[PDB]
Amino acid sequence: NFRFPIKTKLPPGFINARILRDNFKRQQFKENEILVKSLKFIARNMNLPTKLRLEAQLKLNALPNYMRSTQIKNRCVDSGHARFVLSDFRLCRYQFRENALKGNLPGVKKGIW
Amino acid sequence: VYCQTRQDPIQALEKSLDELAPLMMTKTFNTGVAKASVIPVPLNKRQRNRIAWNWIVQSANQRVSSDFAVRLGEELTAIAKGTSSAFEKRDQIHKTAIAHRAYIQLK
Amino acid sequence: SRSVWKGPNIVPLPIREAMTKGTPIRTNARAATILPQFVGLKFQIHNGKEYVPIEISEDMVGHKLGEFAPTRKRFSYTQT
Amino acid sequence: VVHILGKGFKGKEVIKIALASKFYGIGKTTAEKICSKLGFYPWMRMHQLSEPQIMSIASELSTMTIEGDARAIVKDNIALKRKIGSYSGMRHTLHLPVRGQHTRNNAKTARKLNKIDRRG
RNA sequence: AUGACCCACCAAU
RNA sequence: AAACUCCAUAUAUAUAAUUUUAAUUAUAUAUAAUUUUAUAUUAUUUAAUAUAAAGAAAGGAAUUAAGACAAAUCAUAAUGAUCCUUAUAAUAUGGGUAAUAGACGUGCUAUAAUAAAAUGAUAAUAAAAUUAUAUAAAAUAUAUUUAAUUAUAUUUAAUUAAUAAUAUAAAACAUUUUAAUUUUUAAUAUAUUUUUUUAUUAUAAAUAUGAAUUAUAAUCUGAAAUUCGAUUAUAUGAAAAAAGAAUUGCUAGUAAUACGUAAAUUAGUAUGUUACGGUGAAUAUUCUAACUGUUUCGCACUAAUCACUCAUCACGCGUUGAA
């Protein structure tokens, strides 16, 4: 059926296979984050019995990779680059310079000070 | 320094510097290398004392105290009495200038 | 998950059925404290390309499946 | 200062750490209160030790585990996993980063000491 | 583009 | 090029009800200097060197032209041409990028007294920066007996920022120590050095430096530290005696600093990157050498001296001589 296990809309603007993978994880984890938090609280509350806790720790290990944010890497929304990615503009060491110098980024120019 | 010999320490130090710092020297300019000539070089005030102070710190690393701050004073007191091997140092230098006086760039 | 609490690592495993015949269960996961509960069987461990067959020992306890399954091969020599 | 526990020490040498030095089974905190139980005024040197006192000193070290006696315990802990399938055992036996450090370059240290009976 | 090569340093009027 | 520009500096105006309090500030603006005035030597109609006198007067940054190196990038992106579409395209799990004989470059930490470590609660003293993909204060428990410090855990106060948090800046300063060092002590007495003196007996090259390193336990983050992270406690304590030929940065708030500080990238780790401030220098222009612009002379070179060019020898192959 859909390439990704669960059908997902496509990220507006620049689209990349690595971006699609990251975007897929973002969409899935966003919804699963609540469950991720629920079950982890379960496993970590000593105030409980070991078994209920274990059952949970285990399910987590079983939860699919997309159910994680550690797996989501900051990637330039415009150039699909995951290296030197400033998060203030969600860009990169180049698209920034480019956008900032060109003036695409308002109030962002050169540190002449 | 003052204590071991009760007279103005700064003045005594200045005198010691004046005594020790040679008034001139001899740099070794290249001039198409070959046989580089040795011509006496005049040494500025801060230039003169700089050499004198070294001959002293170098002589303060031969003392005993585990505090250079004051191994300096004793050397300084020693110099006052007239005991800093440096004097000879000066003498040789000057001598190496007496000769090599001829090479003087201009009168 | 290395701590007195949160001890230790539960990696879902066919140990149950394995505990019957003992079939070396291809536990490709290779990332779990050797379970101190069943502590005893035989299985192969994916060393990147091949799963090395090993069983359980009187040393293999906290030691994680991977610690027994070497990946990179040994170094060699210069040019001659 | 004398033949205390065989390999003794020297005078002027405050005992507290002196023990941490010569002795291998004891060091730092262990040596510190080791004097505390024997109650010797701190900052006290070896020369001042009243021989009879050393006697207590000796017994004290016998009580806990000192000398290469423990060298072996680790030697065995090493041989342990080593004897099992243990990356370490390879790293340790081959003389290579047992702490997974810079095998590629800075590894001479490992090669120098890391070995079956490491602590040599 | 044709296009695998480069070789010598000695001291003054 | 310079100049305008930005930071920064002097003053001046406006704003802040002086509880966002730092009014010693923060900005918005305006002026200011690429300093000027005067005399005296020199020179030749008026420049330089000294002197004074008026002002606060002083820096950094950004901007690096044309061209060339067919310099770097087809992995920021994008695109031509060419090559694959059941695989050179997409996904999951594990592995790898962390492998190590040797070699190089760059750092860090080092080798102890013109230097290192505890300690300093009327908290000596800062700027810059962060905090709705959060910082996380007081305490509270443990490591540990007091307490402090240090590291984790419990609960989240306040603050989404001139408000509260990271965060009491640290170095300097003071006192205490400190191997070798027999320069020590510790038992005596000795006494107008008392934290000290002196007489006597004793006190047999890696240390209390160095933390590479090795075990065990413990803690963070996250499903998950095993190849492979971080932290601490108890242990371990190699190498290292200022480092050959050789070579690197820096000319003033710069270098140096065992001076700390912050941010970005982090679920998580900086010996790196980018910024901030504290303390704060010597040395100098006179030689060669190298790179550049201005010029001389020469020039057989011109993808230009990393040019170009010459003869022998050695290889293979023509023609034409002697005999």
Three-state SS string over D17-78 comes to HHHHHHCCCCCCHHHHHHHHHHCCCCCCECCCCCCHHHHHHHHHHHHCCCCHHHHHHHHHHH
Pairing of strands C42-47, C50-55: antiparallel
Q: Please tell me what resolution, in angstroms, this structure has.
A: 3.2
The Cα of A52 is separated from the nearest Cα of chain C by a number of Å equal to 13
Task: Note the CA–C1' distance, B47 to F295, in angstroms.
Answer: 37
Q: Is residue A9 part of a domain?
A: no
Cβ atoms within 10 Å of A77's Cβ, excluding its own: 18
* Residue of chain A nearest C31, judged by CA positions: A61
- C68, D85: Cβ pair inside 8 Å? yes
CA of D98: nearest nucleotide by C1' is F214
Match 């002795």 to its residue by tokens: D23
B6, exposed or middle or buried, with CB in 10 Å at 0-12, 13-18, 19+?
exposed
Range of the domain at A68: 17-102
Q: Is residue A12 part of a domain?
A: no
- b (16+ CB within 10 A) / e for B10-38: eebbeebbeebbbeebbeeeeeeeeeeee
The Cα of D33 is separated from the nearest Cα of chain C by a number of Å equal to 29
Angle, helix B9-20 to helix B86-98, in steps of 10 degrees? 40
DSSP state letter for B102:
T
* Contact yes or no, C with A (3+ CB pairs under 8 Å): yes
A37, exposed or middle or buried, with CB in 10 Å at 0-12, 13-18, 19+?
exposed
Q: How many domains are contained in chain A?
A: 1
Question: Do B47 and B24 touch, CB atoms closer than 8 A?
Answer: no
Question: Do C27 and C43 touch, CB atoms closer than 8 A?
Answer: yes
Q: Is residue A110 part of a domain?
A: no
Q: Report the C-alpha gap between D35 and D49 in whole angstroms.
A: 11
- C67, D86: Cβ pair inside 8 Å? yes
The one-letter code for the residue type at A94 is Y
Q: Which long-range contacts (CB under 8 A, 24 or more apart) does A31-40 make?
A: A32/A63, A32/A66, A32/A67, A33/A69, A35/A67, A36/A60, A36/A63, A36/A67, A36/A68
- D84, C74: Cβ pair inside 8 Å? no
CA of A82: nearest nucleotide by C1' is F76
DSSP state letter for B59:
G
Q: Which residues of C touch A43 (CB under 8 A)?
A: 6
> Which bases of chain E are contacted by protein, using any atom under 7 A from a CB?
11-12
Task: Note the CA–C1' distance, D37 to F173, in angstroms.
Answer: 39
Per the document, the length of chain D is 120
Q: Report the C-alpha gap between D101 and B52 in whole angstroms.
A: 52
Name, in order, each residue with C-beta under 8 angstroms of B37's C-beta and a sequence gap of 6 or more.
B28, B29, B31, B103
Q: Is residue A55 part of a domain?
A: yes
Q: Report the C-alpha gap between B38 and C17 in whole angstroms.
A: 97
Q: Report the C-alpha gap between C7 and C5 in whole angstroms.
A: 5
Strand E footprint at Cβ < 7 Å?
A: B 31-37
Name, in order, each residue with C-beta under 8 angstroms of B23's C-beta and a sequence gap of 6 or more.
B43, B48, B94
- b (16+ CB within 10 A) / e for D63-91: eeebeeeeeeeebeebbbbbebbbbbbeb
CATH number, residue A94: 1.10.287.1480
Name, in order, each residue with C-beta under 8 angstroms of C68's C-beta and a sequence gap of 6 or more.
C45, C52, C54, C60, D84, D85, D86
Q: Is residue A3 part of a domain?
A: no
Q: Is residue A56 part of a domain?
A: yes
User: CA-based diameter of chain D, in Å?
Assistant: 55
What would the two tokens of residue B90 be?
Answer: 């000066």
Question: Do C75 and D89 touch, CB atoms closer than 8 A?
Answer: no
CA of B37: nearest nucleotide by C1' is F287
Task: Note the CA–C1' distance, A8 to F248, in angstroms.
Answer: 57
Q: Say yes or no: Cβ of B61 under 7 A from any atom of strand F.
A: yes
Elucidation method: cryo-EM
What would the two tokens of residue C72 be?
Answer: 């990179």
- Provide residues 64-103 of D with CB closer than 7 Å to any strand F atom: 70, 73-74, 77-78, 80-81, 87-88, 92, 96-103
Q: Report the C-alpha gap between C60 and C69 in whole angstroms.
A: 12
Q: Report the C-alpha gap between A108 and A100 in whole angstroms.
A: 5
